Design a protein around this ligand. Structure first.
Ligand SMILES: [Br-]
Length: 208
């Protein structure tokens, strides 16, 4: 399918205020270590003052913190979701299914991703590396996408409706009982991975 509208809304969702895109990759890399991330650690990596880190995170109202005030979630999260994202010996999570396909290239690590089919509950798993996917179980795994025309922030709609499914037919049957739901589309996990690659290409071009 034509993916430009999906890429565009994802990119528009991240380039909110200066620095969000600039802080995103180092933050994802730190969260991938599986422990809460301090503002000061981020500040050191970016060579920013910590108050500037706080100012950019202040814009990202959906950022998750723990009881210590340290960062535990931004796309990749330490709090349990339906999308398990394992790096090394550390079990992390993601906010939506497409996130799990995007983050490996950004963090530069291979992840073992698992979930359950949103329509049937069947376990699904795959290995996602920066450049390819493998061990796609079951092989016909699908992903749902939405295109809220128009939300500035696609986070809420994707959290709600961007899942893994055991197959394209199962996903399309699920999608059929979402009559009227805006820009709802089903793709294979291969097509979704391609979307993420193209998103990542654009995102990374916008960094210095
Ligand atoms: Br288009």
């Amino acid at each position: 399918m034509k993916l430009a509208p999906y890429i565009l809304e994802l990119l528009t969702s991240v380039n909110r205020t200066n620095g969000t895109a600039d802080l995103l990759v180092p933050l994802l890399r730190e969260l991938a270590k599986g422990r809460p991330v301090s503002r000061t650690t981020l500040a050191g990596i970016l060579d920013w003052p910590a108050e500037r880190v706080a100012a950019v995170l202040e814009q990202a109202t959906s950022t998750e913190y723990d009881k210590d005030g340290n960062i535990i979630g931004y796309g990749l999260t330490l709090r349990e979701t339906s999308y398990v994202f394992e790096i090394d010996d550390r079990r992390l999570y993601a906010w939506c299914a497409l996130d799990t396909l995007i983050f490996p290239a950004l963090i530069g690590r291979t992840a073992r991703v698992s979930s359950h089919c949103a329509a049937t509950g069947a376990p699904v798993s795959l290995t996602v590396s920066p450049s390819e996917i493998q061990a796609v179980e079951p092989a016909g795994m699908a992903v749902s996408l939405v295109l809220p025309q128009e939300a500035a922030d696609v986070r809420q709609s994707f959290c709600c409706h961007v899942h893994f499914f055991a197959s394209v037919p199962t996903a399309e049957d699920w999608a059929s009982k979402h009559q009227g739901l805006e820009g709802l589309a089903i793709v294979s996990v291969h097509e979704a991975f391609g979307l993420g690659q193209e998103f990542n290409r654009h995102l990374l071009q916008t960094m210095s």
